Amino acid sequence: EYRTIKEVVGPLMAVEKVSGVKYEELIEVRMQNGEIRRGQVLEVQEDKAMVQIFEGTSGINLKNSSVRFLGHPLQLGVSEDMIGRVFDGLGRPKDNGPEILPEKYLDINGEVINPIARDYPDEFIQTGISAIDHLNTLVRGQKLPVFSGSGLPHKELAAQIARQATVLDSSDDFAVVFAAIGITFEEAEFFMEDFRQTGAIDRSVMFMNLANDPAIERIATPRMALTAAEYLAYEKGMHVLVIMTDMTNYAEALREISAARREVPGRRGYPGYLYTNLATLFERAGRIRGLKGSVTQIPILTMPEDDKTHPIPDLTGYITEGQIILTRELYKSGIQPPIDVLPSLSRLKDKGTGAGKTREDHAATMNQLFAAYAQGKQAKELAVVLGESALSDIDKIYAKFAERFENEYVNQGFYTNRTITETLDLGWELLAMLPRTELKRIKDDLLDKYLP
Amino acid sequence: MIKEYRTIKEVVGPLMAVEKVSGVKYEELIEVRMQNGEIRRGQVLEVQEDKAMVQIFEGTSGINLKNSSVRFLGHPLQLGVSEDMIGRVFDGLGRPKDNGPEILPEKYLDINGEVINPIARDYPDEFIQTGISAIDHLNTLVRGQKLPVFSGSGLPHKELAAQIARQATVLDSSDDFAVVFAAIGITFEEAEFFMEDFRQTGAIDRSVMFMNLANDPAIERIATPRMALTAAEYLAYEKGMHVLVIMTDMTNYAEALREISAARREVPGRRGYPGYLYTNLATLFERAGRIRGLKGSVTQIPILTMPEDDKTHPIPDLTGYITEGQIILTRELYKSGIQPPIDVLPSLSRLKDKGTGAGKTREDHAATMNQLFAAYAQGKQAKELAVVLGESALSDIDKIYAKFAERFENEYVNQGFYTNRTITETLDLGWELLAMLPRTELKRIKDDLLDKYLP
Amino acid sequence: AEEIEKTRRRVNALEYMTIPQLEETIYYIKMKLEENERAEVTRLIKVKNM
Amino acid sequence: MQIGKIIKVSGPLVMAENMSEASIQDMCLVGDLGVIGEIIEMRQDVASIQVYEETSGIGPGEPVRSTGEALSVELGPGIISQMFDGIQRPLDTFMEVTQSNFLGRGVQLPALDHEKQWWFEATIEEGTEVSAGDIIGYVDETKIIQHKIMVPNGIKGTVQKIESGSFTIDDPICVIETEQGLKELTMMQKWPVRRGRPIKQKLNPDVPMITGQRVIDTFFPVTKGGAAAVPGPFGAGKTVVQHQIAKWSDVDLVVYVGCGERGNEMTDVVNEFPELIDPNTGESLMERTVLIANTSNMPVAAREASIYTGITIAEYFRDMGYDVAIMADSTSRWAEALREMSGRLEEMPGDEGYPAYLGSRLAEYYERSGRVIALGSDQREGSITAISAVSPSGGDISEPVTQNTLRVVKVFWGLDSSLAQKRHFPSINWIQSYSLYSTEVGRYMDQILQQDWSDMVTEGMRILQEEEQLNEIVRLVGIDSLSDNDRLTLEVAKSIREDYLQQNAFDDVDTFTSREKQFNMLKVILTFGKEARKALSLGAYFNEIMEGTVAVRERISRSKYIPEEELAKISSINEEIKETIQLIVS
Amino acid sequence: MQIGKIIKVSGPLVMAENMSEASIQDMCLVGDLGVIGEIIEMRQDVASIQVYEETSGIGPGEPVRSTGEALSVELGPGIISQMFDGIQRPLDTFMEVTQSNFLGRGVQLPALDHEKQWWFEATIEEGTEVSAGDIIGYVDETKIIQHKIMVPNGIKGTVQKIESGSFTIDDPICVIETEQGLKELTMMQKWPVRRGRPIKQKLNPDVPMITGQRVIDTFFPVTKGGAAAVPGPFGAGKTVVQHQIAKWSDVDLVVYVGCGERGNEMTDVVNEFPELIDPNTGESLMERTVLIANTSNMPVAAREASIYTGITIAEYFRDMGYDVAIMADSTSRWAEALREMSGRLEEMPGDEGYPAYLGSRLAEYYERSGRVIALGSDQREGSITAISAVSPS
Numbered sequence A: 001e002y003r004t005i006k007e008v009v010g011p012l013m014a015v016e017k018v019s020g021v022k023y024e025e026l027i028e029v030r031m032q033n034g035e036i037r038r039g040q041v042l043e044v045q046e047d048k049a050m051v052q053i054f055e056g057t058s059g060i061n062l063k064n065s066s067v068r069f070l071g072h073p074l075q076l077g078v079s080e081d082m083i084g085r086v087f088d089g090l091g092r093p094k095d096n097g098p099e100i101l102p103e104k105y106l107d108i109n110g111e112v113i114n115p116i117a118r119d120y121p122d123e124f125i126q127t128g129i130s131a132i133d134h135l136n137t138l139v140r141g142q143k144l145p146v147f148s149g150s151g152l153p154h155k156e157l158a159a160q161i162a163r164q165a166t167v168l169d170s171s172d173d174f175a176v177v178f179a180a181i182g183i184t185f186e187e188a189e190f191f192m193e194d195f196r197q198t199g200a201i202d203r204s205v206m207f208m209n210l211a212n213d214p215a216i217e218r219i220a221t222p223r224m225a226l227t228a229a230e231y232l233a234y235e236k237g238m239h240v241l242v243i244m245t246d247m248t249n250y251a252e253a254l255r256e257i258s259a260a261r262r263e264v265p266g267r268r269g270y271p272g273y274l275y276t277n278l279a280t281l282f283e284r285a286g287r288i289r290g291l292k293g294s295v296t297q298i299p300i301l302t303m304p305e306d307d308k309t310h311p312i313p314d315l316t317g318y319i320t321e322g323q324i325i326l327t328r329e330l331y332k333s334g335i336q337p338p339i340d341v342l343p344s345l346s347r348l349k350d351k352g353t354g355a356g357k358t359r360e361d362h363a364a365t366m367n368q369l370f371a372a373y374a375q376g377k378q379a380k381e382l383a384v385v386l387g388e389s390a391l392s393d394i395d396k397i398y399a400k401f402a403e404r405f406e407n408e409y410v411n412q413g414f415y416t417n418r419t420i421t422e423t424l425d426l427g428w429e430l431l432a433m434l435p436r437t438e439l440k441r442i443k444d445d446l447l448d449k450y451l452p
Numbered sequence B: 001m002i003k004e005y006r007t008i009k010e011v012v013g014p015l016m017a018v019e020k021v022s023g024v025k026y027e028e029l030i031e032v033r034m035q036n037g038e039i040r041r042g043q044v045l046e047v048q049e050d051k052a053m054v055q056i057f058e059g060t061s062g063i064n065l066k067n068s069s070v071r072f073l074g075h076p077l078q079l080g081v082s083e084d085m086i087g088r089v090f091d092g093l094g095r096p097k098d099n100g101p102e103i104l105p106e107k108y109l110d111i112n113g114e115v116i117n118p119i120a121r122d123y124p125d126e127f128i129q130t131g132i133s134a135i136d137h138l139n140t141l142v143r144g145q146k147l148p149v150f151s152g153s154g155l156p157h158k159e160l161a162a163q164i165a166r167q168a169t170v171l172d173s174s175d176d177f178a179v180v181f182a183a184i185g186i187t188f189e190e191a192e193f194f195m196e197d198f199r200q201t202g203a204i205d206r207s208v209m210f211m212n213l214a215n216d217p218a219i220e221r222i223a224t225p226r227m228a229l230t231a232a233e234y235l236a237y238e239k240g241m242h243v244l245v246i247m248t249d250m251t252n253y254a255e256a257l258r259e260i261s262a263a264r265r266e267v268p269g270r271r272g273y274p275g276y277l278y279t280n281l282a283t284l285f286e287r288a289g290r291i292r293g294l295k296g297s298v299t300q301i302p303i304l305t306m307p308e309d310d311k312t313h314p315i316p317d318l319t320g321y322i323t324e325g326q327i328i329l330t331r332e333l334y335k336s337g338i339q340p341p342i343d344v345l346p347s348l349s350r351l352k353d354k355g356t357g358a359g360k361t362r363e364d365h366a367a368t369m370n371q372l373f374a375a376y377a378q379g380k381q382a383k384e385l386a387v388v389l390g391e392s393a394l395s396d397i398d399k400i401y402a403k404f405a406e407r408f409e410n411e412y413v414n415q416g417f418y419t420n421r422t423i424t425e426t427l428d429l430g431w432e433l434l435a436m437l438p439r440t441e442l443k444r445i446k447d448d449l450l451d452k453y454l455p
Numbered sequence C: 001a002e003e004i005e006k007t008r009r010r011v012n013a014l015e016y017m018t019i020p021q022l023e024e025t026i027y028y029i030k031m032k033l034e035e036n037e038r039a040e041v042t043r044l045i046k047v048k049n050m
Numbered sequence D: 001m002q003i004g005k006i007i008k009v010s011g012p013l014v015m016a017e018n019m020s021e022a023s024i025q026d027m028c029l030v031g032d033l034g035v036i037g038e039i040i041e042m043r044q045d046v047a048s049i050q051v052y053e054e055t056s057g058i059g060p061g062e063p064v065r066s067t068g069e070a071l072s073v074e075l076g077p078g079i080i081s082q083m084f085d086g087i088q089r090p091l092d093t094f095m096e097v098t099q100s101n102f103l104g105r106g107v108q109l110p111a112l113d114h115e116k117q118w119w120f121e122a123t124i125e126e127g128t129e130v131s132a133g134d135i136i137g138y139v140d141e142t143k144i145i146q147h148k149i150m151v152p153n154g155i156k157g158t159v160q161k162i163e164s165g166s167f168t169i170d171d172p173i174c175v176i177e178t179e180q181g182l183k184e185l186t187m188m189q190k191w192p193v194r195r196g197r198p199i200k201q202k203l204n205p206d207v208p209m210i211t212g213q214r215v216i217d218t219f220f221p222v223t224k225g226g227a228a229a230v231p232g233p234f235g236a237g238k239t240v241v242q243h244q245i246a247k248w249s250d251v252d253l254v255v256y257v258g259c260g261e262r263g264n265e266m267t268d269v270v271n272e273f274p275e276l277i278d279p280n281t282g283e284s285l286m287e288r289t290v291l292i293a294n295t296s297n298m299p300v301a302a303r304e305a306s307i308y309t310g311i312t313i314a315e316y317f318r319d320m321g322y323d324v325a326i327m328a329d330s331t332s333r334w335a336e337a338l339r340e341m342s343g344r345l346e347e348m349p350g351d352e353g354y355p356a357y358l359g360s361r362l363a364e365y366y367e368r369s370g371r372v373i374a375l376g377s378d379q380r381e382g383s384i385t386a387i388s389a390v391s392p393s394g395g396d397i398s399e400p401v402t403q404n405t406l407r408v409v410k411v412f413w414g415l416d417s418s419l420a421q422k423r424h425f426p427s428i429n430w431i432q433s434y435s436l437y438s439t440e441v442g443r444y445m446d447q448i449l450q451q452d453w454s455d456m457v458t459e460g461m462r463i464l465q466e467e468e469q470l471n472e473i474v475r476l477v478g479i480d481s482l483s484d485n486d487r488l489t490l491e492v493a494k495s496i497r498e499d500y501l502q503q504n505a506f507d508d509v510d511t512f513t514s515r516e517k518q519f520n521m522l523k524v525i526l527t528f529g530k531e532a533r534k535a536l537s538l539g540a541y542f543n544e545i546m547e548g549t550v551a552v553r554e555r556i557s558r559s560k561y562i563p564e565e566e567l568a569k570i571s572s573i574n575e576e577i578k579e580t581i582q583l584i585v586s
Numbered sequence E: 001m002q003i004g005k006i007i008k009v010s011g012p013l014v015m016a017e018n019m020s021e022a023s024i025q026d027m028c029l030v031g032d033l034g035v036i037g038e039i040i041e042m043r044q045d046v047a048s049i050q051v052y053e054e055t056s057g058i059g060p061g062e063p064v065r066s067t068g069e070a071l072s073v074e075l076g077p078g079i080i081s082q083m084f085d086g087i088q089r090p091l092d093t094f095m096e097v098t099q100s101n102f103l104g105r106g107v108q109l110p111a112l113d114h115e116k117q118w119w120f121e122a123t124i125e126e127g128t129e130v131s132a133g134d135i136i137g138y139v140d141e142t143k144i145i146q147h148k149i150m151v152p153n154g155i156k157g158t159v160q161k162i163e164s165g166s167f168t169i170d171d172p173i174c175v176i177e178t179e180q181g182l183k184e185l186t187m188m189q190k191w192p193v194r195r196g197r198p199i200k201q202k203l204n205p206d207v208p209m210i211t212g213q214r215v216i217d218t219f220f221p222v223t224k225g226g227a228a229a230v231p232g233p234f235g236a237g238k239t240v241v242q243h244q245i246a247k248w249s250d251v252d253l254v255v256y257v258g259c260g261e262r263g264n265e266m267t268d269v270v271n272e273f274p275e276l277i278d279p280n281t282g283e284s285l286m287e288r289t290v291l292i293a294n295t296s297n298m299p300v301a302a303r304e305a306s307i308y309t310g311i312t313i314a315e316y317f318r319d320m321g322y323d324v325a326i327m328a329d330s331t332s333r334w335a336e337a338l339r340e341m342s343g344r345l346e347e348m349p350g351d352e353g354y355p356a357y358l359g360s361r362l363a364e365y366y367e368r369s370g371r372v373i374a375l376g377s378d379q380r381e382g383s384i385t386a387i388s389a390v391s392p393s
C-alpha cells in the first residue's frame, strides 16, 4: 500500500512512485478518517499514476491517505443465478436479495467475433408493437436501436418491448438484459416496478446506473450488461434480448473522462474514438455457428435537439441495422407509441418474415401500407395548399387512410400487446379502405385471399 | 516610503511583467517611470511569488526595460471625488481635460465600489417621464433603473440618449437630474454632439463627464465606466443627488476587455471574449438604483451598438441578461423615417408595473400598453403578409390591423427627437389608435376602461 | 382570370422571394456552423498546449 | 496550528503553500483581511483556493488558516422569513452589524439568531430509543409552519433528559445516552451543503402541484417532488413564472435562490411577499419562504454556494414532512461560475467552454429533489419540487446547461422570444415544451374531477399541434385555400392560445386559476369547437357560425376574469354554445 | 532488433523508450499481450504509439516489439480463395489455430500457410539475366488461376540455380548472382500497403470491360483500368449488382474489400460470395477471388488499411499480366476510419471532420488503379479496375 499521493485536481488524483500499475486498473483509497473510496486508473506513467475517484475527493487529506492497487480492472461476477436479479452499474446487488456467489470473473470488453463465425439472424421476434413487428421487423441477433428525444416516451416504449417481446413457438424463452445508463431514479424505479408488476423480472437481469452515479460507472454499465448477456447466451445457450438506455448519457460519460486525460475532441465535442467505442458495444450481438443462444440488442438513445445529424444518432445508424424513430409531432397528437415509420428502418426485416415465420403477406402488405401512408400524407397536404376541391375521390381515401393508420394502427397504447396475426389482419382492414385497384405492389394471388 | 523596482522582466503589448518584487497586492495601482521620465499608470493583474503582471493603461510604446522602473502605490485605482466635479470634464482616468481649477478631493474611492446589500436596496418605482411615447407607455423607465439602448453603427442612438437627458423628469416635483456621462472609445463628433447639446441646454453645469475618445488608449476604457459609476454613486448616496448615468459605447468596453484577455492568453470564451464577461458587465450595471433611507438615486442608461446588428452577440445578449429591460433601435425603422427608431416588440422594461397605474401615471396605463402591443404585433404581421401577397390576400379585419400598424409607427412611435409628450397626452394618443380597431378585438382591456376612455 | 393572377402572385412570391430566402439562409447557417466548429477546435488545441 | 502562506493571487483564485494538513473542500480564512475561501485543489503542500469574497488588496506572503470544515448551513429555528447570502449570512444582520448599506469583506456572521429565545415543546418522552430523524419536539417558528427538532444524523441512543420551556438554539434542550456516551442536543444542527441529507427511501411523485398557471397545471404539470426547468432568453419571463409558482403553490415551504441575478428582484421579494396574505391560512407569504441571494455582481464562487445552501435547507424541512419548493434563478449563472473557474484553472473544457463534468454536477443537484420517506420512526412523507431557470445564450437551447438539465428533469417549460414579443405570457412554447408527468397527473385529475380530463388535454394539445402543422403551410401559401374545417381548427386553437394559455400575472383574478376553474374554461373552449364541428357537418358555413357566435365567444374570452365564487357563469356557457349554434342552422 | 519499454499508457496512446532502432509508421506489438500498434512520433529513443486495440491491462514496464516494417502484406501462393481482415489476418487460420470464434488480442498469425507444399514449375533456365518482374516460374494455386512466381523488386542479376519440384513458400527455389553477391529467392515477397508497386509505364484505360450488364456496357461503360463510384441506398440491390460485376466481368482476379461494415452485413458478403459461380468453369468465384472483411468493431487500422491491402494484392497479380478488379464497399466507411484517426491524432479538422488530406488519400488509392505495363523484359500488360461503393449518411 502506497501512502504516496502527490496531487488532487478536482475528482482527479495523482499517485506517485508506484510500479506494475496497469491502465484502467481499479484502486482503493483509504483516507485519514478510515473511509474507503474506490477508483480507477485513467493514466499511468513512469513513477506517477493518475486515478479518478468515483465518489469524489471531498474531505481528502493526501499526506495522510493511502492508495491500494487492486491489480485488476472492472470485472463481472457471473452465474446462472443472475436471472431475476437487479444490480447497479458495477454489477453489485441492488434488490436487497440473497447475495450471489459468482462462478467466475470476466472482463467486460468482450471479444471481436470472427467474421466467418457469425450466423445470420433468422428468427422473427414478436415485440407486440405493430409499427415495429410489421413495418420494421426485429430479428433474433439484430441490433435495432430506438431514436428518441427528450420528453419522448421511450421509457414507456422500452418497458413495453421488454414486457411483450417473445418468439413464436420456441418454448425455451427469453432472458431480457435491461441496462439503465445514467438515468434518474424516478425512471429506473419505473422500470424496476414494471418488471415486478408483470413478472418480467423473473426472466430478466437488470443493471441500473443512476444519473448522479459516477461517470466511470455509466461507461461500464453497458459493457457489464452485454458481458452478462454473452455469458447467458454463449455459455448457457439462452436467447438474450438486451435493452439499453439512455445511450446519449453514455457518450457524455465518455466525454467527461476524455477531458480528464486532456484529449482534444472531434466532431461536435465528442472523442475521436467514439466510433470504435460504439462499434465495440453494438457489435456484441448476433448468433454464432455451433452455438445455441443469441444476443439481440435494442440500444436506445435521445437525439439532442431532435437532430438526426448529431454524432450519436449518426454514428449509431452506421453500426446498427436500421433504427426506430420517435417524433415529437406524433407524440403531441396523442399517438403512442409515437413511431414514425417513414424514417424508420429495419435492415434485416427480410430475414424474419414470410411463411413459417409470419404469414406470406407480411413483406407484401408492409410495402403497400408504407406506400399508401406516404400518399396519404401527400394528399392531406394537398387539401391545405390547394384545398378541398383539388382532392380526387381517390385522394380523399388516401387522406382518410393515413389518419386511420396513425390513430388505429400506430396508436395502440403502451400496454397493448398485438399478435402478428392481429397486426397483419389490421393492416388488411386498413387497405380495405382503398379500392383493389390501388394495391398494385401486392400479388393478387395474395390479394384475393386476405383482402377484406 | 515609495515602493519602486528597477527589475522589469518582459514587455508584451499592454502587459508588463515585473520580477524580484515584494509586498505587492492584487489590483494594485502602479506607475511606470519610463526612461524618458514619462509617467504611465497601470494596474496589477496577477501576483505570484516575486513576480507581478501589470496592464499599462497608456500602453508600452517606446519602453526600454533596463532603464525603466515600476512604482507600487499601495492602493487600488482610486478616484478623487468632490462636488466640485459638477460642471467639470475629465479624461478616462478621471484627470481634468477642460483645463480648469485643481479638484481638491473630499475623499478617495475604490472605483470598483461595493455591492449594495439587497435588503438595503429600495425598489425603484418612481415614474420618469421621458417624453418619448415608445418609452413612457410601453417600456416605462423608472428612477433608479438600468435601461440601456440597443443600437447599431450609423443609427441615431446619440440623439435618443440626448433627448432622454433633456426631457427626463419625475411628476409632482421640481427635481432634475445630475448627469454623469461616460465616453468610451467614441469618436470626436460622437462626443462633441453631447458636448454641444449639454451646453445649449445648460445641462453642462449639472453634469460630470469622463471622456475616453477613439484616439485614447484602449485599455483606459476598462477604468472609464467605473470612474463614472463611482462618481455617480458618490453624488447620489453621499451628496443626495438623483444621478442619470449615460455610458457609450459599451461595446468598446467589452472589446477592451477582450484585448487584455487575449494579451493575457486567457482561456477564450465565445469570439475571444473572456469567460467572465457577464460578471464583469454586471459589476457595472448593478451599480444603480435606490437605497433605503437615502434620498439619492442612480439611473443607468448604457448605450451599446450590437455588432452585425445581432443581439445574440455576447455583448448585447449578456447585457440583456443583466439590465432591467432594453430599448432596441432597428435599422428598418430608421430608414422608414421613424424618430426615434424604437422597435417596441423586442423592447422591454422590467420595472414598468409598480411605476405606473393610479397615482403614478393613469389607471389605464397597463391595459392600453398590452393592447397596443398585441395589436401592433398582429398589425405588423399583417403588414409583411400584405407586402408579399398583396392587399387583397388578407382578411378584412387584418387589413385594419395593417392600417393600425402603419399609423402606430408614423404617429405614435415617430414623434421627433425634440418633442416632449406628457404621459397624459401619450395615453390619450394610445386610445386614439385603439379606436380604429373594433371594440370586440380589445380583449386585453376590461369593459370598465373601454366605456370610460374609448371614443 | 382573377384566380389565375392570385395564384400567379403566390407562385411568384414563393419562387422569387420565399424559396431563395430559405435556400441560402440555409447556406449561410451551414457555413456559419462549420465556421464555429473549426473555431472551437482551434481553441481547444491551444488550451491543451497551455 | 498550521498557517499557510499565499504564493499566488489572481481574481477569486488564490494558491497558498504550507497547507499539507488541510483537506479538499475545506473552508479557509485567506489573507490579513481573513476572507472566506475553499480548497478546491491540492498539489503537495500547495493548496488552490477559490474565494467567496473579493480578493482586491490581497497579495503573496499573507497567512491562510483552515477551518477544517466544509461549507455548511446552520439548520434550526430562525431560518424562515430570512434572507441569506450565498454562504448563508443574514443580510439584514449583516446590515446592522457592519453599519453599512453595502457588502464588505472578512465579516464572519453566525447564520441564525443564537440569542433569540424560542419556546421548545417536548413531545417525546424520556426513555425512548431514538435515531436520526426522530422528532423530539417542535418550535412554532411561524403560525402555520411548525419547526420540528429532529435527532441529527449519526446520533443513536435513548432519551435521558428532556423538557419544554424557553431556550436559545445553543441551550441543550435534550440529552441522549449513546454507546459513545451522553450527548447534548441543541435545536440547531450543522450540515455540509454538498452532501445530500440521507433519506429512508425515495418515492415516485404522483400528486400534481397546484400552481394556478393554466398552461402549467393543464398541459405541462409538475408533481410535488417533481423537477422542472424554465429555459428562455432574456425578457422571456423566467423570473415572473418562478414568482407565480412561489406565491400560489400548495406547498408548505418555498425556498427561493437568487443565483447570480438582479439585486432588485431579491428586493422585490422581501417587500412584496410579506403583504401577500393567504385567507385560508391567514398568514403572510414570507412566513413560509426562505431567501438565498447571491446577485450577479456578488462573488462568483458564491453562486454554487447559493444553490447548495438552498437545496440543503429544503432537504431540512423536507425531513420534517413538509412539501418544499426550491426555486433556482438562475442555474446558468452557477454553470457560468464553474466555466469561469474552469478556465482560470486552464482545464480542458467541454462544449462551449463549460467543464466536462457540468452534467454530473447538475445530475447531483436535481437528484437531491424528489418525494421521499424521511428518516425516523414516524416514516414521514416529504417532497422537494425543484423549479430551475436556465438562461441559454441567445435562447439557443442547444447549449450544454439546458441540454444537461433536460437529461435529468422531467418537466420542460420552454420559453420563446416570439411569444414574449407578442405579449403571450407565460411565453411557453407549447410545441417544444413537455411533461413526463402528464399521463399520471391525467389519471389523478380524471379521478378528482370525475370528468374525462385526459381526453380534453390530449385534444387540446392535438388541436394546438394541428394548428402548428397548418401554420407551417399557411406561412408560404397563404390563407386562401383553407377548408371550413381547418379554419374552425385555427379558431379553436386561437381560443386555446388567447383565452386559456395567455395569463396575466399582474391581474387580480387572472394571476391564479383554480383546478375547477381550469376545467370549466377548457370545457367551454372545446365545447364550442365540437358543437361548431357538428354544425359544419350539417351544411352550415364557417362564417355563418362566427357571425352568430360573436356574443358567446366573448364570454369565452373573458372567462379568465370570472371570480372564483361565480364559476356557474362559465358552466352556463356550454348551454348557450349549443343553443346558439343550432339556431344558426336555420 | 531492439525491444521497447513502455513508459506511459493513456487511452489508445502508448509511449515507450528504447525505440531508437525503430522507424516511423512501423507496425508494433505493444505490451506483454502484444496488441496492434503503430509508431506515429519519436523523440530521441521515445516512441509515441497509437494502439489500435484496447489498452486495458497494459502498463509501464511491458515490452514493445517493432515488426521492423510498415503495415505490409505477404504475397505468394496460398493467398487466393482466402479471407483476410484489413491487416491481412487469415480468418480461417484463426478458427483452426486459436480454436475459438474470436479475433483475440495479441494473436499474430502469418497470412499464408508456410508449411503447405506447392509444386513449383520452372519456366526459365540457367545463365539467364533477370530483372525485377521477370517470371522465373509458375504455380497452379487454384483450378482457375495460375500463380506466376516473379522476381522481387530491387533484385537484378543472373540465375545461378533453379529447378522444378515441390517446395513451400520459404524454401529456396532460385539463386540469383547479383552485384551484392549471391541472393536466394523464395516463392513469397513482402510489400507495404501504402506504397504502390512499381511499373514500367502507366497507360490509358481505353478498352471497355465486358460486364454483360446492358445499362453499364452501353450507356455508362467502364474500361479495364477505369474507376466507378456506386451509391448504396438500402433496398437498391447493390449486392446483386456487385455479384453480377464480379463473376461476369472479363477480369482474371477479383479483389473484394469490406470496410468497417455492419457485422450482419459483412456475414452476408463473407458467405454469399463463396456461393457465387464462375460461369466459364463452374467453380466458386473464390477460386479467383481474394476477400478482405472488416466489421465496424474491428481495429480502426484494419478498417482504414482495408482498401490499401486489397489494391496491393490487386497490383501484385496485375504485375503477372492479369486483369484484376478491385471492389471496395464501403469507402464512405473507410473514410470514417480516417476521420476517427484524424481526431485521435489531434490534427486540424477539414470539411465535416474529415482530415485535410482526405482528397489526397482518395487520389492515392484510385491512381494506383489502372492499366499498366508491368515491370519485366516481357513488358506485360495488366490492369486494375476499381468499383467502389459510397454509402453516405
Ligand SMILES: [Mg+2]
Pocket (backbone or CB within 6 Å): D237, D238, D239, D240, D261, D329
Ligand atoms: Mg430572470
